[PDB]
Swiss-Prot record:
One of its GO terms (biological process) is tetrahydrofolate biosynthetic process. The gene is DFR1. It catalyses: (6S)-5,6,7,8-tetrahydrofolate + NADP(+) = 7,8-dihydrofolate + NADPH + H(+). Pathway: Cofactor biosynthesis; tetrahydrofolate biosynthesis; 5,6,7,8-tetrahydrofolate from 7,8-dihydrofolate: step 1/1. Residues 5-191 form the DHFR domain. Key enzyme in folate metabolism. Catalyzes an essential reaction for de novo glycine and purine synthesis, and for DNA precursor synthesis. This is Dihydrofolate reductase. NADP(+) binds at residues 11, 18-24, 56-58, 78-80, 113-120. Substrate binds at residues 32-37, 72, 112, 118. The keyword Ubl conjugation does not apply. Coiled coil: none annotated. It is an enzyme of class 1 (oxidoreductase). Keywords: NADP, One-carbon metabolism, Oxidoreductase. Belongs to the dihydrofolate reductase family.
Length: 192
């Protein structure tokens, strides 16, 4: 695949854009996990599937029994990896672009974490779309967090919900979803 448009998908707590704590997610939002699965798995063309790219540490954080994530091509990046096809579902690579040379019959490509991957790849021109779940809490300061997004959002535009709906197709997008003390919304951003 030559120069595909890539999208980053992440869930972050406003206003600091915290994303983790001690190698884990600082929340358990059941509906958000379901959204993440639907958006990353659905395709429109026929014999296609999407690709999900993640850093080695995120891959290792998924219980062995539950990886690879089903119905998607999984790509794992490590600076110590040679570019190799493990099986039909797993690729090892040392750079996003080298990995893509090894794929065919992929519709969309998603970067799924973690922090180091996000913070570095946001500045790569292949990234054309950010799918950010904006999480709000009454006391964000009480949620322990150690890992944060460092995105230059002044160079990006938040689109109207209509544009997101067109992006996701069929997926149901509920507004102001509440789960315990958290309230969240799905958003789409594109470059200015
Ligand atoms: N809120 C959300 O939506 C999400 C949050 N997360 C959270 O992120 C945190 C985990 O993030 P983090 O620890 O930073 O780990 P990552 O998942 O980002 O893995 C980092 C590893 O990926 C490799 N790597 C990093 N950058 C590159 C690059 N540019 N090219 C090639 N390989 C690269 C290196 O592998 P090596 O060392 O082998 O060279 C590095 O050690 C946790 O808190 C986790 O829960 C994860 C996903 C989503
Ligand atoms: C398959 O699920 C694994 C978890 C954490 O890894 C251990 N997982 C990994 C990445 C994501 C994730 C994401 N990137 N974006 C949004 N919006 N929500 C998500 C929620 C669960 C996630």
């Amino acid at each position: 695949m030559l120069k595909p448009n890539v999208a980053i998908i992440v869930a972050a707590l406003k206003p600091a854009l915290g994303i983790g704590y001690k190698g884990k997610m600082p929340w358990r939002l059941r509906k958000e996990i379901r959204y993440f699965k639907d958006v990353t798995t659905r395709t429109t063309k026929p014999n296609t599937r999407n690709a999900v790219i993640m850093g080695r540490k995120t891959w290792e954080s998924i219980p062995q029994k539950f990886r690879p994530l089903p119905d998607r091509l999984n790509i794992i990046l490590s600076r110590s990896y040679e570019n190799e096809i493990i099986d039909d579902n797993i690729i090892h690579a040392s750079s996003i672009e080298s990995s893509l040379n090894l794929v065919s019959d992929v519709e969309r490509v998603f970067i799924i974490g973690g922090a180091e991957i996000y913070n570095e790849l946001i500045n790569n021109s292949l990234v054309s779309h950010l799918l950010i779940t904006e999480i709000e809490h009454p006391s964000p300061e009480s949620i322990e967090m150690d890992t944060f997004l460092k995105f230059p959002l002044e160079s990006w535009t938040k689109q109207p919900k209509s544009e997101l709906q067109k992006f996701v197709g069929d997926t149901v997008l509920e507004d102001d979803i509440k789960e315990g003390d958290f309230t969240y919304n799905y958003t789409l951003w594109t470059r200015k």
